[PDB]
Amino acid sequence: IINRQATINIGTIGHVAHGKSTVVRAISGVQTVRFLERNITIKLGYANAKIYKCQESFKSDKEISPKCQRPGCPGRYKLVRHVSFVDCPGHDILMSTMLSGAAVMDAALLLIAGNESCPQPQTSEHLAAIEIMKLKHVIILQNKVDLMREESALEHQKSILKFIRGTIADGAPIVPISAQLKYNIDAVNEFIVKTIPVPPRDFMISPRLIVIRSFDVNKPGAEIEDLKGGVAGGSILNGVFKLGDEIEIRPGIVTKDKGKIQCKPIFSNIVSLFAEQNDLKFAVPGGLIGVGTKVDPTLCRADRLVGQVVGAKGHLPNIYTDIEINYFLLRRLLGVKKQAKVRKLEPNEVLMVNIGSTATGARVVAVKADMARLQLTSPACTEINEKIALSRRIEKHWRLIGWATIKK
């Protein structure tokens, strides 16, 4: 079987202390990245899951290891798909990293524990963000069943089924699994192949890249004579990248501080590409690929490349300070444990506006019926339209209000 990188981005959502990283470990094998220098930029893990089906039974055909000795048939497995995991945070404060991960994703995996309460505030907030940013391919997973009884787990299923009625998603598959015990993983791998079709993705579309994480490979003990370039942990949704192409990071750079700054987007050339495990020349869109650029390892250290757009040379994305948004408000607030009715937007108020991956604090200038004018403190770029989820300060930390679209 030939070595191939990620084809579709599949994420995992749940709640705190459930064990989302243990679920990722049970499916793939390699443990989470977060658990100082390398990887650390946004709260997300990295593990690649292998799907090889033995068609020489039913659900047990899709296996973790490529060599088939487990299901019964001595014949070797056939290549179907290779997937990448982008684990999103399940916390009320960490909202910008969740919405940044949702734009990267194409399919979702929901985790609800048996022993805990049925209506959870964070999972409903993740479900609302899925409905906003178009991620309808959702598989519901039960986290812990062995602590629960025979009838109580069935009653918990009935409460989940009654909860999913008014939402847009109608047909979502439900699987009972365990992370520590390691069971029924083969059924989930079967559902990933069947229920989720890969969207049409072509060579024709102009190259665009979204940077989430920042890698710097500087080793203790090793001298300055051998240095590695600043690798950007970015995700591609459109346009095929290869080795030896010019890249500009759009929003801007702070290098010089009376007067004015007149700086271009950060120019860099691709040196190395990191995909799956081994070195590869081509970058297939629909997966997290570590693009090793000429940009300094000091710039790709920690918290500098969190939600920044990248365009290829010969293309001009526009930089905006005043953005025109077409907003729609929900009935009641999602995320809070008391649920309150969403009030009308007041002029001049700080709101965390997440345009795909960019985290910006924006002030409302004019209030209308459907449209709103917003002024950004830090510049954010717009390419086409981009899916936006709005969040506001009402009670202590940030709470989601609704969805928005740029009309430019």
């Binding site: 069943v145 062995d146 787990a153 069935l154 299923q157 699987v175 009972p176 699994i177 015990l181 059924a187």
Partner: peptide, 17 residues
């Protein structure tokens, strides 16, 4: 969909430590 789920749950309860 909650029809093949009940067979998967019964398979899980049968094979436990």
């Amino acid at each position: 969909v909650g029809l093949p789920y009940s067979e998967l749950l019964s398979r899980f309860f049968n094979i436990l430590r």
